[PDB]
Amino acid sequence: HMRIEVRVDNGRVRVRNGTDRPCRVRVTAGGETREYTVNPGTELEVELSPEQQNNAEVEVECGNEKYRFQL
Amino acid sequence: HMRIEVRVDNGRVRVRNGTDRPCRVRVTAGGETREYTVNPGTELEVELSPEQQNNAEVEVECGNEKYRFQLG
Ligand SMILES: [Mg+2]
Numbered sequence: 001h002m003r004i005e006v007r008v009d010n011g012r013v014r015v016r017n018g019t020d021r022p023c024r025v026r027v028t029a030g031g032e033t034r035e036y037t038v039n040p041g042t043e044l045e046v047e048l049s050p051e052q053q054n055n056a057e058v059e060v061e062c063g064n065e066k067y068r069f070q071l
Numbered sequence: 072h073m074r075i076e077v078r079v080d081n082g083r084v085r086v087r088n089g090t091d092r093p094c095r096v097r098v099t100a101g102g103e104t105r106e107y108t109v110n111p112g113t114e115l116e117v118e119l120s121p122e123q124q125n126n127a128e129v130e131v132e133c134g135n136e137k138y139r140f141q142l143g
Contacts, residue, residue, distance in 0.1 A: 007141035054125075069140045070078040 006058050006069045011048040019062050029056035077140045082124035087114040100127035
């Protein structure tokens with residue numbers, strides 16, 4: 001069972017929820033952090049600046065569990 | 072609580088197991104697939120080829136749950 005998928009390819013950040021509850025997504029790039037919400041069975045798409053596509057961090061919080069992906 | 076942490080930096084892949092059970096890690100880059108077992112509370116460190124540091128996939132299997140992280 002694929003629960004969480006995170007893909008970063010040329011600026012585009014693709015965080016995907018495969019759980020039964022919504023998850024919070026925090027994207028840290030360029031020294032700033034933004035929070036997003038992706039519902040169950042839904043895929044989130046965020047774009048990165050050209051000067052931050054290779055120095056980003058994606059943090060997904062589902063329930064009380066945290067998953068972090070740093071580039 | 073941090074369950075899984077994946078870091079890719081200039082070819083160095085780091086996977087930390089924050090769970091209570093061992094997890095299976097599959098690293099695919101440039102058509103080559105390597106698999107590892109990471110014990111709870113431990114961090115796995117792998118090195119990538121210079122031609123595949125910007126194109127890699129890290130797949131973590133913790134029991135029945137699968138987690139995929141993709142660069143590129
Ligand atoms: Mg194995």
